[PDB]
Amino acid sequence: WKASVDPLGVVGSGADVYLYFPVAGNENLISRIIENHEKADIKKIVDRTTAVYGAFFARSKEFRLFGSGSYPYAFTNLIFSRSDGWASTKTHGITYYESEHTDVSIPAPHFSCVIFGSSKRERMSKMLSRLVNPDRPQLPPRFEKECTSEGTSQTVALYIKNGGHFITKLLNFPQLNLPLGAMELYLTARRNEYLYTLSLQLGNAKINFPIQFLISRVLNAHIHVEGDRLIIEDGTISAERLASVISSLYS
């Protein structure tokens, strides 16, 4: 069953936000996000991970994460200590570790699964069943491309169904509840900030040159419209604010 695993089919269909982080080049950002949510075992896992695939579900308030990495027995044995509030349970052989808000499995030496969030978060055995029968989420072409680029790219990818709501956060405005569609967002680290490009689905709504210029100057970015999509390129956001924007999905 480990022969062919699509991590996006494992985190599941129907998410409000899909995320992909190559760990190399994005260490500080991922550390900050983890810190915002509460400890050592998760950081330890990340330090052995090459790529993280994530899905956030607003209704059940949870993140589901899948990591590709190297998780040998000598490593796993030394984490999930009961003095840290981790309980283990035994199941087709696999061990599950549970805590108040975080469940973790290492179902094979190169895969990790983490489910974090409210008491309505998915059961680990249900996520693990998607190792055998995966879901089939639909993702945009560059997001799909980034997901198979580990080693060649360090671009962080997000796909956000409610792009209206996210754009206000990302651009530091207040919550307006804009009538806009899906957003694709691609970021790459420069020093302590991120450079990004995004596309935002506008629908039939027009955006005139005045609103365009003002956002543009606010962001110090190149902006244009293509068909029904607003394209922003060369925007910047600090790694600290980016981490907060992502963290703020939960709570």
mmCIF file with all atom_site columns, N, CA and C in Angstrom, residues 21-87:
data_model
loop_
_atom_site.group_PDB
_atom_site.id
_atom_site.type_symbol
_atom_site.label_atom_id
_atom_site.label_alt_id
_atom_site.label_comp_id
_atom_site.label_asym_id
_atom_site.label_entity_id
_atom_site.label_seq_id
_atom_site.pdbx_PDB_ins_code
_atom_site.Cartn_x
_atom_site.Cartn_y
_atom_site.Cartn_z
_atom_site.occupancy
_atom_site.B_iso_or_equiv
_atom_site.pdbx_formal_charge
_atom_site.auth_seq_id
_atom_site.auth_comp_id
_atom_site.auth_asym_id
_atom_site.auth_atom_id
_atom_site.pdbx_PDB_model_num
ATOM 1   N N  . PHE A 1 21 ? 4.323   22.783 1.997  1.00 0.00 ? 21 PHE A N  1
ATOM 2   C CA . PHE A 1 21 ? 5.575   23.433 2.423  1.00 0.00 ? 21 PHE A CA 1
ATOM 3   C C  . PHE A 1 21 ? 6.761   22.486 2.171  1.00 0.00 ? 21 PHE A C  1
ATOM 4   N N  . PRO A 1 22 ? 7.648   22.806 1.212  1.00 0.00 ? 22 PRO A N  1
ATOM 5   C CA . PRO A 1 22 ? 8.964   22.149 1.247  1.00 0.00 ? 22 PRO A CA 1
ATOM 6   C C  . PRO A 1 22 ? 9.679   22.589 2.530  1.00 0.00 ? 22 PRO A C  1
ATOM 7   N N  . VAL A 1 23 ? 10.202  21.665 3.324  1.00 0.00 ? 23 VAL A N  1
ATOM 8   C CA . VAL A 1 23 ? 10.805  22.080 4.604  1.00 0.00 ? 23 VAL A CA 1
ATOM 9   C C  . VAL A 1 23 ? 12.103  22.888 4.382  1.00 0.00 ? 23 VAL A C  1
ATOM 10  N N  . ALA A 1 24 ? 12.946  22.456 3.447  1.00 0.00 ? 24 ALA A N  1
ATOM 11  C CA . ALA A 1 24 ? 14.212  23.194 3.130  1.00 0.00 ? 24 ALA A CA 1
ATOM 12  C C  . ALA A 1 24 ? 13.935  24.606 2.618  1.00 0.00 ? 24 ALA A C  1
ATOM 13  N N  . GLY A 1 25 ? 14.521  25.591 3.301  1.00 0.00 ? 25 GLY A N  1
ATOM 14  C CA . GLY A 1 25 ? 14.322  27.005 2.977  1.00 0.00 ? 25 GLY A CA 1
ATOM 15  C C  . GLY A 1 25 ? 13.159  27.657 3.707  1.00 0.00 ? 25 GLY A C  1
ATOM 16  N N  . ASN A 1 26 ? 12.339  26.834 4.364  1.00 0.00 ? 26 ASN A N  1
ATOM 17  C CA . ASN A 1 26 ? 11.170  27.328 5.092  1.00 0.00 ? 26 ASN A CA 1
ATOM 18  C C  . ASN A 1 26 ? 11.116  26.997 6.575  1.00 0.00 ? 26 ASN A C  1
ATOM 19  N N  . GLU A 1 27 ? 12.286  26.705 7.141  1.00 0.00 ? 27 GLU A N  1
ATOM 20  C CA . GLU A 1 27 ? 12.401  26.245 8.519  1.00 0.00 ? 27 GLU A CA 1
ATOM 21  C C  . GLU A 1 27 ? 11.851  27.207 9.559  1.00 0.00 ? 27 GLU A C  1
ATOM 22  N N  . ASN A 1 28 ? 12.202  28.485 9.440  1.00 0.00 ? 28 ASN A N  1
ATOM 23  C CA . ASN A 1 28 ? 11.746  29.503 10.386 1.00 0.00 ? 28 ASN A CA 1
ATOM 24  C C  . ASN A 1 28 ? 10.225  29.664 10.335 1.00 0.00 ? 28 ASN A C  1
ATOM 25  N N  . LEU A 1 29 ? 9.688   29.803 9.127  1.00 0.00 ? 29 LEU A N  1
ATOM 26  C CA . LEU A 1 29 ? 8.238   29.927 8.972  1.00 0.00 ? 29 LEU A CA 1
ATOM 27  C C  . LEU A 1 29 ? 7.480   28.764 9.647  1.00 0.00 ? 29 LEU A C  1
ATOM 28  N N  . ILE A 1 30 ? 7.898   27.539 9.363  1.00 0.00 ? 30 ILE A N  1
ATOM 29  C CA . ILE A 1 30 ? 7.202   26.361 9.900  1.00 0.00 ? 30 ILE A CA 1
ATOM 30  C C  . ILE A 1 30 ? 7.346   26.330 11.427 1.00 0.00 ? 30 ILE A C  1
ATOM 31  N N  . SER A 1 31 ? 8.546   26.640 11.926 1.00 0.00 ? 31 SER A N  1
ATOM 32  C CA . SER A 1 31 ? 8.759   26.730 13.367 1.00 0.00 ? 31 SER A CA 1
ATOM 33  C C  . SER A 1 31 ? 7.787   27.695 14.008 1.00 0.00 ? 31 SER A C  1
ATOM 34  N N  . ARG A 1 32 ? 7.635   28.887 13.426 1.00 0.00 ? 32 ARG A N  1
ATOM 35  C CA . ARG A 1 32 ? 6.733   29.905 13.976 1.00 0.00 ? 32 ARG A CA 1
ATOM 36  C C  . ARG A 1 32 ? 5.276   29.458 13.982 1.00 0.00 ? 32 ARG A C  1
ATOM 37  N N  . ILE A 1 33 ? 4.838   28.827 12.898 1.00 0.00 ? 33 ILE A N  1
ATOM 38  C CA . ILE A 1 33 ? 3.466   28.318 12.869 1.00 0.00 ? 33 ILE A CA 1
ATOM 39  C C  . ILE A 1 33 ? 3.255   27.292 13.971 1.00 0.00 ? 33 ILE A C  1
ATOM 40  N N  . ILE A 1 34 ? 4.191   26.353 14.098 1.00 0.00 ? 34 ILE A N  1
ATOM 41  C CA . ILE A 1 34 ? 4.079   25.325 15.135 1.00 0.00 ? 34 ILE A CA 1
ATOM 42  C C  . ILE A 1 34 ? 3.992   25.948 16.528 1.00 0.00 ? 34 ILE A C  1
ATOM 43  N N  . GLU A 1 35 ? 4.900   26.892 16.805 1.00 0.00 ? 35 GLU A N  1
ATOM 44  C CA . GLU A 1 35 ? 4.918   27.639 18.058 1.00 0.00 ? 35 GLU A CA 1
ATOM 45  C C  . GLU A 1 35 ? 3.588   28.285 18.414 1.00 0.00 ? 35 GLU A C  1
ATOM 46  N N  . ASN A 1 36 ? 2.936   28.902 17.423 1.00 0.00 ? 36 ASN A N  1
ATOM 47  C CA . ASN A 1 36 ? 1.632   29.543 17.610 1.00 0.00 ? 36 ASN A CA 1
ATOM 48  C C  . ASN A 1 36 ? 0.534   28.566 18.072 1.00 0.00 ? 36 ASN A C  1
ATOM 49  N N  . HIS A 1 37 ? 0.754   27.262 17.880 1.00 0.00 ? 37 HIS A N  1
ATOM 50  C CA . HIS A 1 37 ? -0.273  26.246 18.180 1.00 0.00 ? 37 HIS A CA 1
ATOM 51  C C  . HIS A 1 37 ? 0.053   25.249 19.302 1.00 0.00 ? 37 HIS A C  1
ATOM 52  N N  . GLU A 1 38 ? 1.279   25.293 19.816 1.00 0.00 ? 38 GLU A N  1
ATOM 53  C CA . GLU A 1 38 ? 1.703   24.492 20.982 1.00 0.00 ? 38 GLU A CA 1
ATOM 54  C C  . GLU A 1 38 ? 2.148   23.100 20.568 1.00 0.00 ? 38 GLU A C  1
ATOM 55  N N  . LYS A 1 39 ? 5.320   19.925 22.743 1.00 0.00 ? 39 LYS A N  1
ATOM 56  C CA . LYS A 1 39 ? 5.984   20.846 21.838 1.00 0.00 ? 39 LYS A CA 1
ATOM 57  C C  . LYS A 1 39 ? 7.164   20.222 21.103 1.00 0.00 ? 39 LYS A C  1
ATOM 58  N N  . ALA A 1 40 ? 8.036   19.534 21.818 1.00 0.00 ? 40 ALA A N  1
ATOM 59  C CA . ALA A 1 40 ? 9.307   19.153 21.201 1.00 0.00 ? 40 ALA A CA 1
ATOM 60  C C  . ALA A 1 40 ? 9.131   18.138 20.069 1.00 0.00 ? 40 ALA A C  1
ATOM 61  N N  . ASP A 1 41 ? 8.188   17.202 20.250 1.00 0.00 ? 41 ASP A N  1
ATOM 62  C CA . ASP A 1 41 ? 8.016   16.070 19.336 1.00 0.00 ? 41 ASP A CA 1
ATOM 63  C C  . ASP A 1 41 ? 7.689   16.558 17.914 1.00 0.00 ? 41 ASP A C  1
ATOM 64  N N  . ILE A 1 42 ? 6.816   17.543 17.827 1.00 0.00 ? 42 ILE A N  1
ATOM 65  C CA . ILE A 1 42 ? 6.412   18.089 16.499 1.00 0.00 ? 42 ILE A CA 1
ATOM 66  C C  . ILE A 1 42 ? 7.599   18.737 15.793 1.00 0.00 ? 42 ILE A C  1
ATOM 67  N N  . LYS A 1 43 ? 8.357   19.567 16.522 1.00 0.00 ? 43 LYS A N  1
ATOM 68  C CA . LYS A 1 43 ? 9.575   20.168 15.967 1.00 0.00 ? 43 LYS A CA 1
ATOM 69  C C  . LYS A 1 43 ? 10.555  19.083 15.559 1.00 0.00 ? 43 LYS A C  1
ATOM 70  N N  . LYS A 1 44 ? 10.726  18.074 16.418 1.00 0.00 ? 44 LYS A N  1
ATOM 71  C CA . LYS A 1 44 ? 11.619  16.965 16.099 1.00 0.00 ? 44 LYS A CA 1
ATOM 72  C C  . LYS A 1 44 ? 11.211  16.256 14.806 1.00 0.00 ? 44 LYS A C  1
ATOM 73  N N  . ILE A 1 45 ? 9.906   16.046 14.630 1.00 0.00 ? 45 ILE A N  1
ATOM 74  C CA . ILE A 1 45 ? 9.390   15.417 13.400 1.00 0.00 ? 45 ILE A CA 1
ATOM 75  C C  . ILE A 1 45 ? 9.706   16.284 12.178 1.00 0.00 ? 45 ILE A C  1
ATOM 76  N N  . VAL A 1 46 ? 9.460   17.589 12.313 1.00 0.00 ? 46 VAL A N  1
ATOM 77  C CA . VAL A 1 46 ? 9.709   18.540 11.211 1.00 0.00 ? 46 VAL A CA 1
ATOM 78  C C  . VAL A 1 46 ? 11.167  18.522 10.791 1.00 0.00 ? 46 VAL A C  1
ATOM 79  N N  . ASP A 1 47 ? 12.086  18.444 11.768 1.00 0.00 ? 47 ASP A N  1
ATOM 80  C CA . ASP A 1 47 ? 13.529  18.384 11.477 1.00 0.00 ? 47 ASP A CA 1
ATOM 81  C C  . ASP A 1 47 ? 13.957  17.157 10.668 1.00 0.00 ? 47 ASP A C  1
ATOM 82  N N  . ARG A 1 48 ? 13.097  16.141 10.621 1.00 0.00 ? 48 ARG A N  1
ATOM 83  C CA . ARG A 1 48 ? 13.327  14.944 9.800  1.00 0.00 ? 48 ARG A CA 1
ATOM 84  C C  . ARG A 1 48 ? 12.397  14.832 8.554  1.00 0.00 ? 48 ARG A C  1
ATOM 85  N N  . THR A 1 49 ? 11.721  15.925 8.206  1.00 0.00 ? 49 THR A N  1
ATOM 86  C CA . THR A 1 49 ? 10.697  15.938 7.142  1.00 0.00 ? 49 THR A CA 1
ATOM 87  C C  . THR A 1 49 ? 11.201  16.714 5.923  1.00 0.00 ? 49 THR A C  1
ATOM 88  N N  . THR A 1 50 ? 10.986  16.186 4.713  1.00 0.00 ? 50 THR A N  1
ATOM 89  C CA . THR A 1 50 ? 11.372  16.927 3.512  1.00 0.00 ? 50 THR A CA 1
ATOM 90  C C  . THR A 1 50 ? 10.218  17.806 2.998  1.00 0.00 ? 50 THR A C  1
ATOM 91  N N  . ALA A 1 51 ? 8.969   17.347 3.183  1.00 0.00 ? 51 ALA A N  1
ATOM 92  C CA . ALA A 1 51 ? 7.810   18.095 2.679  1.00 0.00 ? 51 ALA A CA 1
ATOM 93  C C  . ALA A 1 51 ? 6.565   17.819 3.518  1.00 0.00 ? 51 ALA A C  1
ATOM 94  N N  . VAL A 1 52 ? 5.760   18.861 3.718  1.00 0.00 ? 52 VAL A N  1
ATOM 95  C CA . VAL A 1 52 ? 4.527   18.761 4.490  1.00 0.00 ? 52 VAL A CA 1
ATOM 96  C C  . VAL A 1 52 ? 3.331   19.143 3.564  1.00 0.00 ? 52 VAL A C  1
ATOM 97  N N  . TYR A 1 53 ? 2.300   18.304 3.546  1.00 0.00 ? 53 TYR A N  1
ATOM 98  C CA . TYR A 1 53 ? 1.055   18.547 2.802  1.00 0.00 ? 53 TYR A CA 1
ATOM 99  C C  . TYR A 1 53 ? -0.021  18.764 3.849  1.00 0.00 ? 53 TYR A C  1
ATOM 100 N N  . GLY A 1 54 ? -0.852  19.797 3.691  1.00 0.00 ? 54 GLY A N  1
ATOM 101 C CA . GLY A 1 54 ? -1.811  20.071 4.733  1.00 0.00 ? 54 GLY A CA 1
ATOM 102 C C  . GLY A 1 54 ? -3.183  20.408 4.162  1.00 0.00 ? 54 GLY A C  1
ATOM 103 N N  . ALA A 1 55 ? -4.204  20.191 4.976  1.00 0.00 ? 55 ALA A N  1
ATOM 104 C CA . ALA A 1 55 ? -5.572  20.583 4.645  1.00 0.00 ? 55 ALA A CA 1
ATOM 105 C C  . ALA A 1 55 ? -6.198  21.142 5.948  1.00 0.00 ? 55 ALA A C  1
ATOM 106 N N  . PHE A 1 56 ? -6.796  22.326 5.854  1.00 0.00 ? 56 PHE A N  1
ATOM 107 C CA . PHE A 1 56 ? -7.559  22.898 6.988  1.00 0.00 ? 56 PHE A CA 1
ATOM 108 C C  . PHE A 1 56 ? -9.069  22.823 6.715  1.00 0.00 ? 56 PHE A C  1
ATOM 109 N N  . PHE A 1 57 ? -9.826  22.315 7.688  1.00 0.00 ? 57 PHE A N  1
ATOM 110 C CA . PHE A 1 57 ? -11.290 22.199 7.584  1.00 0.00 ? 57 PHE A CA 1
ATOM 111 C C  . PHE A 1 57 ? -11.971 23.111 8.596  1.00 0.00 ? 57 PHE A C  1
ATOM 112 N N  . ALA A 1 58 ? -12.654 24.151 8.119  1.00 0.00 ? 58 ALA A N  1
ATOM 113 C CA . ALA A 1 58 ? -13.198 25.163 9.004  1.00 0.00 ? 58 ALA A CA 1
ATOM 114 C C  . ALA A 1 58 ? -14.311 24.621 9.911  1.00 0.00 ? 58 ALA A C  1
ATOM 115 N N  . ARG A 1 59 ? -15.176 23.782 9.355  1.00 0.00 ? 59 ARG A N  1
ATOM 116 C CA . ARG A 1 59 ? -16.380 23.338 10.091 1.00 0.00 ? 59 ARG A CA 1
ATOM 117 C C  . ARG A 1 59 ? -16.053 22.449 11.283 1.00 0.00 ? 59 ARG A C  1
ATOM 118 N N  . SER A 1 60 ? -15.104 21.538 11.088 1.00 0.00 ? 60 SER A N  1
ATOM 119 C CA . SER A 1 60 ? -14.604 20.672 12.169 1.00 0.00 ? 60 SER A CA 1
ATOM 120 C C  . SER A 1 60 ? -13.345 21.233 12.867 1.00 0.00 ? 60 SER A C  1
ATOM 121 N N  . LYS A 1 61 ? -12.938 22.450 12.479 1.00 0.00 ? 61 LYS A N  1
ATOM 122 C CA . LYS A 1 61 ? -11.779 23.173 13.081 1.00 0.00 ? 61 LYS A CA 1
ATOM 123 C C  . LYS A 1 61 ? -10.551 22.308 13.267 1.00 0.00 ? 61 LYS A C  1
ATOM 124 N N  . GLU A 1 62 ? -9.923  21.884 12.170 1.00 0.00 ? 62 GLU A N  1
ATOM 125 C CA . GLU A 1 62 ? -8.816  20.946 12.292 1.00 0.00 ? 62 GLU A CA 1
ATOM 126 C C  . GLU A 1 62 ? -7.871  21.129 11.142 1.00 0.00 ? 62 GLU A C  1
ATOM 127 N N  . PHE A 1 63 ? -6.602  20.801 11.365 1.00 0.00 ? 63 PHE A N  1
ATOM 128 C CA . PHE A 1 63 ? -5.639  20.665 10.276 1.00 0.00 ? 63 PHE A CA 1
ATOM 129 C C  . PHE A 1 63 ? -5.300  19.190 10.177 1.00 0.00 ? 63 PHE A C  1
ATOM 130 N N  . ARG A 1 64 ? -5.149  18.687 8.950  1.00 0.00 ? 64 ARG A N  1
ATOM 131 C CA . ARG A 1 64 ? -4.659  17.337 8.744  1.00 0.00 ? 64 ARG A CA 1
ATOM 132 C C  . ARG A 1 64 ? -3.421  17.478 7.931  1.00 0.00 ? 64 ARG A C  1
ATOM 133 N N  . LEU A 1 65 ? -2.343  16.817 8.360  1.00 0.00 ? 65 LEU A N  1
ATOM 134 C CA . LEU A 1 65 ? -1.033  17.039 7.763  1.00 0.00 ? 65 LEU A CA 1
ATOM 135 C C  . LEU A 1 65 ? -0.400  15.705 7.429  1.00 0.00 ? 65 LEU A C  1
ATOM 136 N N  . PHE A 1 66 ? 0.279   15.675 6.303  1.00 0.00 ? 66 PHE A N  1
ATOM 137 C CA . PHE A 1 66 ? 1.010   14.520 5.896  1.00 0.00 ? 66 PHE A CA 1
ATOM 138 C C  . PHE A 1 66 ? 2.448   14.930 5.578  1.00 0.00 ? 66 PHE A C  1
ATOM 139 N N  . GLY A 1 67 ? 3.403   14.228 6.186  1.00 0.00 ? 67 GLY A N  1
ATOM 140 C CA . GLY A 1 67 ? 4.841   14.550 5.993  1.00 0.00 ? 67 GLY A CA 1
ATOM 141 C C  . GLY A 1 67 ? 5.597   13.420 5.310  1.00 0.00 ? 67 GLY A C  1
ATOM 142 N N  . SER A 1 68 ? 6.467   13.748 4.339  1.00 0.00 ? 68 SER A N  1
ATOM 143 C CA . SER A 1 68 ? 7.385   12.753 3.775  1.00 0.00 ? 68 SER A CA 1
ATOM 144 C C  . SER A 1 68 ? 8.710   13.045 4.425  1.00 0.00 ? 68 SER A C  1
ATOM 145 N N  . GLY A 1 69 ? 9.363   12.009 4.945  1.00 0.00 ? 69 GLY A N  1
ATOM 146 C CA . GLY A 1 69 ? 10.654  12.203 5.592  1.00 0.00 ? 69 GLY A CA 1
ATOM 147 C C  . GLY A 1 69 ? 11.316  10.882 5.916  1.00 0.00 ? 69 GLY A C  1
ATOM 148 N N  . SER A 1 70 ? 12.139  10.913 6.950  1.00 0.00 ? 70 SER A N  1
ATOM 149 C CA . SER A 1 70 ? 12.898  9.728  7.399  1.00 0.00 ? 70 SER A CA 1
ATOM 150 C C  . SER A 1 70 ? 12.627  9.603  8.887  1.00 0.00 ? 70 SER A C  1
ATOM 151 N N  . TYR A 1 71 ? 11.829  8.615  9.257  1.00 0.00 ? 71 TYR A N  1
ATOM 152 C CA . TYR A 1 71 ? 11.386  8.472  10.633 1.00 0.00 ? 71 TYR A CA 1
ATOM 153 C C  . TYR A 1 71 ? 11.734  7.072  11.176 1.00 0.00 ? 71 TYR A C  1
ATOM 154 N N  . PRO A 1 72 ? 13.045  6.783  11.312 1.00 0.00 ? 72 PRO A N  1
ATOM 155 C CA . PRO A 1 72 ? 13.511  5.479  11.819 1.00 0.00 ? 72 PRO A CA 1
ATOM 156 C C  . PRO A 1 72 ? 13.032  5.181  13.236 1.00 0.00 ? 72 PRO A C  1
ATOM 157 N N  . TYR A 1 73 ? 13.006  3.905  13.591 1.00 0.00 ? 73 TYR A N  1
ATOM 158 C CA . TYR A 1 73 ? 12.589  3.454  14.929 1.00 0.00 ? 73 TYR A CA 1
ATOM 159 C C  . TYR A 1 73 ? 13.348  4.148  16.064 1.00 0.00 ? 73 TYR A C  1
ATOM 160 N N  . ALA A 1 74 ? 14.641  4.386  15.855 1.00 0.00 ? 74 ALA A N  1
ATOM 161 C CA . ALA A 1 74 ? 15.516  4.965  16.882 1.00 0.00 ? 74 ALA A CA 1
ATOM 162 C C  . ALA A 1 74 ? 15.095  6.398  17.160 1.00 0.00 ? 74 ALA A C  1
ATOM 163 N N  . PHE A 1 75 ? 14.481  7.028  16.163 1.00 0.00 ? 75 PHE A N  1
ATOM 164 C CA . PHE A 1 75 ? 13.938  8.369  16.351 1.00 0.00 ? 75 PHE A CA 1
ATOM 165 C C  . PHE A 1 75 ? 12.587  8.292  17.050 1.00 0.00 ? 75 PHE A C  1
ATOM 166 N N  . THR A 1 76 ? 11.655  7.521  16.478 1.00 0.00 ? 76 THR A N  1
ATOM 167 C CA . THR A 1 76 ? 10.290  7.450  17.008 1.00 0.00 ? 76 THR A CA 1
ATOM 168 C C  . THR A 1 76 ? 10.217  6.953  18.445 1.00 0.00 ? 76 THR A C  1
ATOM 169 N N  . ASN A 1 77 ? 11.056  5.978  18.790 1.00 0.00 ? 77 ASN A N  1
ATOM 170 C CA . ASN A 1 77 ? 11.095  5.482  20.161 1.00 0.00 ? 77 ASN A CA 1
ATOM 171 C C  . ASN A 1 77 ? 11.367  6.545  21.236 1.00 0.00 ? 77 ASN A C  1
ATOM 172 N N  . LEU A 1 78 ? 12.077  7.601  20.847 1.00 0.00 ? 78 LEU A N  1
ATOM 173 C CA . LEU A 1 78 ? 12.542  8.643  21.762 1.00 0.00 ? 78 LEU A CA 1
ATOM 174 C C  . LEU A 1 78 ? 11.625  9.858  21.862 1.00 0.00 ? 78 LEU A C  1
ATOM 175 N N  . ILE A 1 79 ? 10.552  9.864  21.077 1.00 0.00 ? 79 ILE A N  1
ATOM 176 C CA . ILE A 1 79 ? 9.535   10.896 21.211 1.00 0.00 ? 79 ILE A CA 1
ATOM 177 C C  . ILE A 1 79 ? 8.231   10.294 21.733 1.00 0.00 ? 79 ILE A C  1
ATOM 178 N N  . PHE A 1 80 ? 7.154   11.084 21.725 1.00 0.00 ? 80 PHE A N  1
ATOM 179 C CA . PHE A 1 80 ? 5.873   10.670 22.301 1.00 0.00 ? 80 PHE A CA 1
ATOM 180 C C  . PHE A 1 80 ? 6.053   10.065 23.693 1.00 0.00 ? 80 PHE A C  1
ATOM 181 N N  . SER A 1 81 ? 6.746   10.771 24.571 1.00 0.00 ? 81 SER A N  1
ATOM 182 C CA . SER A 1 81 ? 6.878   10.302 25.943 1.00 0.00 ? 81 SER A CA 1
ATOM 183 C C  . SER A 1 81 ? 5.584   10.557 26.724 1.00 0.00 ? 81 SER A C  1
ATOM 184 N N  . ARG A 1 82 ? 5.170   9.591  27.541 1.00 0.00 ? 82 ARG A N  1
ATOM 185 C CA . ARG A 1 82 ? 3.994   9.768  28.415 1.00 0.00 ? 82 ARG A CA 1
ATOM 186 C C  . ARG A 1 82 ? 4.108   10.931 29.406 1.00 0.00 ? 82 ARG A C  1
ATOM 187 N N  . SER A 1 83 ? 5.327   11.356 29.722 1.00 0.00 ? 83 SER A N  1
ATOM 188 C CA . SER A 1 83 ? 5.473   12.512 30.603 1.00 0.00 ? 83 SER A CA 1
ATOM 189 C C  . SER A 1 83 ? 5.173   13.812 29.858 1.00 0.00 ? 83 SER A C  1
ATOM 190 N N  . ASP A 1 84 ? 4.994   13.728 28.542 1.00 0.00 ? 84 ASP A N  1
ATOM 191 C CA . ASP A 1 84 ? 4.635   14.906 27.767 1.00 0.00 ? 84 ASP A CA 1
ATOM 192 C C  . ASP A 1 84 ? 3.146   14.944 27.454 1.00 0.00 ? 84 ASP A C  1
ATOM 193 N N  . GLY A 1 85 ? 2.413   13.966 27.989 1.00 0.00 ? 85 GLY A N  1
ATOM 194 C CA . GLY A 1 85 ? 0.965   13.888 27.815 1.00 0.00 ? 85 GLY A CA 1
ATOM 195 C C  . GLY A 1 85 ? 0.530   13.134 26.572 1.00 0.00 ? 85 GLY A C  1
ATOM 196 N N  . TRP A 1 86 ? 1.399   12.249 26.072 1.00 0.00 ? 86 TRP A N  1
ATOM 197 C CA . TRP A 1 86 ? 1.127   11.397 24.907 1.00 0.00 ? 86 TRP A CA 1
ATOM 198 C C  . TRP A 1 86 ? 0.669   10.010 25.331 1.00 0.00 ? 86 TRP A C  1
ATOM 199 N N  . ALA A 1 87 ? -0.474  9.568  24.814 1.00 0.00 ? 87 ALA A N  1
ATOM 200 C CA . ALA A 1 87 ? -0.942  8.208  25.049 1.00 0.00 ? 87 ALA A CA 1
ATOM 201 C C  . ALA A 1 87 ? -0.849  7.448  23.753 1.00 0.00 ? 87 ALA A C  1
#
